[PDB]
Amino acid sequence: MKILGISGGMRNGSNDGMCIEALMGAKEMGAEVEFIQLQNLHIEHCTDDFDWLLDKMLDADGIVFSTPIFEKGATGLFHTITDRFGPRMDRGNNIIGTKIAEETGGTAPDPRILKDKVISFMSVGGSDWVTRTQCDAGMLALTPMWKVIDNEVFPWALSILVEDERVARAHQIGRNIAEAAKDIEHAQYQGDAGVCPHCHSRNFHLQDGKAICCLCGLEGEIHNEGGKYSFTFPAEQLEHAHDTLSGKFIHGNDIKENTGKKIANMQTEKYKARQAAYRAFITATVPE
Ligand SMILES: Cc1cc2nc3c(=O)[nH]c(=O)nc-3n(C[C@H](O)[C@H](O)[C@H](O)COP(=O)(O)O)c2cc1C
Ligand SMILES: O=c1cc(-c2ccc(O)c(O)c2)oc2cc(O)cc(O)c12
Known about the structure:
- The protein has eight helices and ten strands.
- It is of the alpha/beta class.
- The chain is globular, with a radius of gyration of 21 Å.
- It is classed as flavoprotein.
- Keywords: flavone reductase, FMN, Luteolin, flavoprotein.
């Protein structure tokens, strides 16, 4: 089993070390290991080394991703990789694209794109401003429905490379991901149970009558029982969860329906005149 470790920190930084430490644990369980340092890659924002990166990820049976924490979440580059995953890696759209290709004599997309895969994440920050990175990390796995094994946060971690018990945790995360990879079907989540019984998220969007899991999208209710929170939802919601095939097929269907409505609206006079008033009112300022 091939484990790919990816770091988004500085060259030779703490994220490099935690990630290489996971890789060492993985080799201990018998895996072939590879390491990619993202500072060596050129990756543009969603509007270039990205295709290469994805090819590397598609060949791995499991992935360990270690990211610095910036403003409580993953780095902007981690969010760009997430942006760029959609068009390429959505499990829903790739199932559709492959069925369509078969039946219409089209060329069969990358079979790798649909293989099951396990992924673990590590978020390394220097303080306790760490409340959003696990969700950010979960979002990247959500689009292709890779099976999350661990999704770990390390606050106060500037000196983590001399904190033996926390380095030992990353070693164990490496063990887990190699073990999970040996049998991706029977691999099971090893991380924290969290609050969302489906996502394991602890991040929720709250409004009167509706608490929403910020990762899996389940709409339900948060309960405070003496300081312990818990999340409940009605079973019909499972159909709609953003990390299930069912919920993705629905989501994509609404996208197709709303995209057709936009195309049609873009041919109305209402649209064209408002747009022309905007073009006439102002011109975008650019640098010299
Ligand atoms: C602009 C910036 C914002 C940061 N924001 C946070 C933060 O919100 N929470 C946090 O825990 N650490 C934060 N950090 C600390 C970085 O996570 C830390 O420097 C990183 O773990 C270093 O990893 P490396 O050694 O691999 O580069 C921030 C660092 C920078 C430079
Ligand atoms: O190393 C850290 C460095 C910084 C930081 C960010 C922007 C600056 O203009 C600056 O002068 C320092 O912010 C942090 C914020 C954190 O929560 C944890 C950290 O380790 C850091």
